[PDB]
Amino acid sequence: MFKNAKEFVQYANKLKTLREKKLNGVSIYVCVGTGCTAKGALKVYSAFEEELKKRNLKVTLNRTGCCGRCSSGPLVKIMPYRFFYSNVAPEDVPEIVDRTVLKGEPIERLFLTDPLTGEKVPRIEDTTLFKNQDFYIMEAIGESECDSIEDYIARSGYESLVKALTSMTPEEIIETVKASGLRGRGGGGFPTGLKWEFTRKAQGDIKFVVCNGDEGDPGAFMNRTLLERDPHLVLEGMIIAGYAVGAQKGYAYIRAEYPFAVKMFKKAIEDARKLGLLGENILGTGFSFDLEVKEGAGAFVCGEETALLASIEGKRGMPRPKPPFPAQSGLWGKPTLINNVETYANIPRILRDGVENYRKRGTENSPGTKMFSVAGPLKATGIIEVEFGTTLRDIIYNICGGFVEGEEFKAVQIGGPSGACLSEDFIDMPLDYDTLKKADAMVGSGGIVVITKKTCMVEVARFFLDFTKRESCGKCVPCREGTMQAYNILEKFTHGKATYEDLKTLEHLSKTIKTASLCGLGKTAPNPILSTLKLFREEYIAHIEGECPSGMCTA
Amino acid sequence: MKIYVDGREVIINDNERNLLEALKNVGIEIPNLCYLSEASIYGACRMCLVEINGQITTSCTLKPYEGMKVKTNTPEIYEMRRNILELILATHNRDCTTCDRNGSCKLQKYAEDFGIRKIRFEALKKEHVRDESAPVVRDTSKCILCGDCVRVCEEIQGVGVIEFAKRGFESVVTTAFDTPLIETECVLCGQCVAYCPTGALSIRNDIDKLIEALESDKIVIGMIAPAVRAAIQEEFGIDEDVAMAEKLVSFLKTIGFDKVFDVSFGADLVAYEEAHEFYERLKKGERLPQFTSCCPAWVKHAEHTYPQYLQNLSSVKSPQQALGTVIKKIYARKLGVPEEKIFLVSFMPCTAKKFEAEREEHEGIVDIVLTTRELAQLIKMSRIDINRVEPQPFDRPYGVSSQAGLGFGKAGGVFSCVLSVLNEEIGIEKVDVKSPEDGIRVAEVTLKDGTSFKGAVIYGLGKVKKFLEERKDVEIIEVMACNYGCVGGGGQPYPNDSRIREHRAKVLRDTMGIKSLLTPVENLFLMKLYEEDLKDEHTRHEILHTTYRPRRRY
Amino acid sequence: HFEKVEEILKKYGYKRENLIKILLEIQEIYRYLPEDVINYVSTAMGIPPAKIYGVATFYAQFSLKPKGKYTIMVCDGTACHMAGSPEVLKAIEEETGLTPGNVTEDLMFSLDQVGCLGACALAPVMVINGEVYGNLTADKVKEILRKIKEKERESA
Ligand SMILES: Cc1cc2nc3c(=O)[nH]c(=O)nc-3n(C[C@H](O)[C@H](O)[C@H](O)COP(=O)(O)O)c2cc1C
Ligand code: SF4
Ligand code: SF4
Ligand code: SF4
Ligand code: SF4
Ligand code: SF4
Ligand code: FES
Ligand code: FES
Ligand code: FES
Ligand SMILES: [Zn+2]
């Protein structure tokens, strides 16, 4: 594990045997990802640990990542028999311990209800929600360990890195990624292999590898979920990339307002360094690679490539005209490779199998799966994962349980402010980088939000423009001034002081902002206006007349 | 190189950075608000839009290729340009009548040409910052956030006291915490003003004080700086003329100035005193290297940045303060009128001289400092045809100077004048001049009786930091804050760029060429002043010497 | 006169590309970025204060005013906003009397709206000194603030 792969395999097999014995023996797995700790999961962990200390009971109490049922309260899984309770409160630790840890009686009250069948399913694998999802990146749901490199190694971890370092060569890793058809999951969809090729052939002896930990959407939390769950999968993907493009240093840019993800990634970097998977030499192959965590002080624009690099260098996150691209001159002018955290997560999975197995999921042009975060009023919400051929109906109903009583589908947001608003018509079209791209929409970063009939679409566009005007870097006139002017017009709309000349001004200004803006933030700033006007123009007309079709606008 | 513009064959240069510049060099202009000064960069205005391959993009970031077909003017581009200009104007403080840039503003010209007659958008309120604490005046309500001033202050002046702050609609160029400029490390060089394309940065106007003084019964005395006369013809769009200063004398007497003196006489005085101070320092190897103290922007910069070199500064005051002290403490007595009766006006190319006149060590010597632009405003207000004014000389006894004193107006002048005085007293065998870089000149000087030394001329603050970090073999260093020296001062006519500054230097050189006095000691009036009123060391120290103190905030 | 600041700077070596991390640690220590501290950082690192001010005013984490004793953070992501976050903001405004980005003159409260906290299932959410909420309403938030104030009055 330190200086060669034979010792690595020995250590890995030892850890596998220990992990299997832990699977057999009694254990507690408390989900600690965001959303579970927002319903009191930390208190549940404290209660379980204190009770075990007081009762003198080799049970391996553990921390696990998000299990995809964030709406189901704090979640606890029992290892020998996957019982996977839900809504577990810190006032119920004695009963759960004394009825399940020792006696083994299933507690029907704390199990997971099924919104479609309305029954307390005992296991999650048997639940329809799990079955309809196509897990490829979320592995060991509820029976995983986030804060430990030993568990990740026991789960066949870093052996892809071993294979890359010792078996195959940079060029072949890149060619494999090219034939795998992995496209950037950060929203752009650019083929990852071509980007890696650009960075590789680019002139220079020093390169860098940057992971964009930003969600790209103020309402989405799936990249954060990935960072909190398996920081070592991201780490492995980045190290593989650094080897492939011949980079010696890499940066993980994570917002400082996500303290848990930053702590987990820092701990993972420390653990990988300790074992020698990072440092002056790895596996004795002469390839050195050190990785660092760059905390973000918070700016939506910093999700942009050039602004990201500017913020990494310690300056204002202000973008610049794209050419030269960062693949040729990025950090300090050295060639740089920037990918989303999801892309790096897909790298080790792809290298684990062949291109043939990886391509069996998705469509001919969109292989693999995608992680989404679902919010808004639904029976089930949270982080999901589906094949790249899934329609919005499939998610919204079979994978999220549908709407809560008294609510019906009106619209859906797919990329947040930069994404598109879709009406009922666009529900029967599979998610795909080509179907929606040419159909005036996109899959986006991963965040999904359902809009019910109780919401006014003018208000939605106003909210997104308010966000855009706050987040604009202020460098160029179209974005800086136009987003503010458009927000002003939208506010006049929501206050009953709007006329038709205002609507014409909004449309023309939207075209100008979309075309003339320097960077992607400004270019997609008017997307909500254009989409809502295409699909819900009658709502704007109604606001002009003097009455909100729904009832949330104050007048 | 063959390209098609609006369906027309155009030949451009084979190697060009972007389409916009190539078309400009071939005579085709694309409207834009990025190219505004020599410190400009492309990409912010977004008005340079062209259509190539049916897609619209900025021509400032488009590399031309053979056979490219570009439409520079389409209805879509028309609408986008008009929208962007309207966006700028909607939140612009539109008060051109009281704006310093009125008449020479690109934004005002575009508003005229684009037929903008109603603000379609809303003049949404911005938290504007107005600052009038310094001779450099800030008003962010006029700023178009071009960033030229930030680059000038950081990269050219090496101060960097102004920066982009906040973001989005509230983006603003400002000092740290919106501190008043007079309380910062700003050296008041006015270079940001020289480069600003709007009225956001301007020079404090003091014409009303001059009118008040001229209307009263006190004796108004004017003194004109060397570099004022080499640049003021630009305001009137007329060719240079070495007789400019004497036309100014005639004009000033016409509007009621009692006396007009030549500050270049003060330059002769300062060079004469500084040469002796430097020679004493060289003889006793004390307080070296010597820094010239004639540039007040450099002096303030040193007080902020090099408190260890404050003793190394020349103790002799600048020509303005030296001549002004002479006028107030010697000439007033020789005239039989109390010093309180004299109102002393200084006409300068420099905003830092306004600060210097108001310094505590100089309080009450120079009553007001007016820049070349303010003097041009006086002339234009009169409507007098300055080019037809009959010249008359400066008034005695401070109206004559050597060519060396007049040479102060451009970088290297004071060093040349010091060398001239040293040569006339202790001859100089040879001088070996070297140019390590663009604005640095290093000269080796060997006197007759040995004791050679090296002196450097540095123009443009910001070069100073690196030069002082790498050269310990120089004994005297001349520092001018503004590139090319005072011909490129902050108070000079706008536009104030490299080519114009070079032309001003040529004008000053031609003016120096017609002078018959070669060195300060050939100035009989200067010698008489020294012989009559500056005899003892105590009087000379009181009259021509000043002190410096460290500058820090807490 | 700033020991902890000197230690942070030495830890990062007064290096420019560590300015963001330095500022975050300073903010954690002082709860904001005071002008004196920014002046000290500018002097020690050889960076003019205007540049540091430009950085500090660009990113959402940094605050130029002291944080409140009870720092109120209300999510304004898509889910929370469609679920009534503006109502929570208005109720906080009408009870405590402060717009987002402000601190009460008595330094007891401070408001700031942040992005999705990763708890959309409880939309709208709101955090006071790290303790989260859910399914909030105007009456509920008024109740929370009233009871926090009442508790603050038993120790006077
Ligand atoms: C305002 C803005 C925010 C963005 N945020 C992200 C982000 O958080 N994560 C990401 O991967 N890409 C983001 N992008 C897209 C990046 O510019 C870039 O395409 C991406 O980081 C490349 O990674 P990929 O290979 O996963 O596509 C953002 C773009 C813009 C204009
Ligand atoms: S579009 Fe907006 S974010 Fe992008 S450079 Fe222009 S002002 Fe900045
Ligand atoms: S900068 Fe001055 S002259 Fe130009 S448009 Fe603005 S107010 Fe008018
Ligand atoms: S006067 Fe000189 S030092 Fe002061 S802000 Fe302008 S350019 Fe910078
Ligand atoms: S002050 Fe003048 S030069 Fe500086 S950014 Fe504003 S308009 Fe441009
Ligand atoms: S170089 Fe001349 S114009 Fe410029 S600040 Fe110095 S004295 Fe004034
Ligand atoms: S954080 Fe626990 S299931 Fe998502
Ligand atoms: S010239 Fe200003 S953006 Fe092109
Ligand atoms: S949108 Fe508020 S917690 Fe996600
Ligand atoms: Zn409405």
Author numbering:
A (entry chain B): 1 to 57, 70 to 567
B (entry chain A): 1 to 554
C (entry chain C): 4 to 159
According to the publication:
The heterotrimeric [FeFe] hydrogenase, HydABC, from T. maritima is a soluble cytoplasmic enzyme involved in fermentation. The electron-bifurcating [FeFe] hydrogenase from Thermotoga maritima (HydABC) requires both NADH and ferredoxin to reduce protons generating hydrogen. Electron bifurcation is a fundamental energy conservation mechanism in nature in which two electrons from an intermediate-potential electron donor are split so that one is sent along a high-potential pathway to a high-potential acceptor and the other is sent along a low-potential pathway to a low-potential acceptor.
The processed cryo-EM map shows that HydABC forms a dodecameric complex, Hyd(ABC)4, composed of a tetramer of HydABC heterotrimer units (from now on referred to as protomers). Oligomerization of HydABC occurs through interactions between four HydA subunits in the core of the complex. The HydA core is the best resolved part of the map, consistent with the core being rigid and homogenous. Based on the density map, each HydABC protomer appears to contain nine redox cofactors including five [4Fe–4S] clusters (one of which forms the [4Fe–4S] subcluster of the H-cluster), three [2Fe–2S] clusters, and one FMN. Electron transfer chains, often connecting distant active sites, are composed of redox-active cofactors usually less than 14 Å apart to allow sufficiently fast electron tunneling through the protein dielectric to sustain physiological processes. In each HydABC heterotrimer, the spatially distant H-clusters and FMN centers are connected via a chain of four FeS clusters (A1, A2, A3, and B2, see Figure 1D for cluster nomenclature). The two tightly interacting HydABC protomers within the Hyd(ABC)2 unit are connected (8.8 Å separation) through the His-ligated [4Fe–4S] cluster (A4) in HydA, part of the so-called Y-junction of iron–sulfur clusters. Within the Hyd(ABC)4 complex, there appear to be two redox networks, each composed of two HydABC protomers with an extended electron transfer chain, separated by at least 50 Å and held together by extensive HydA–HydA interactions.
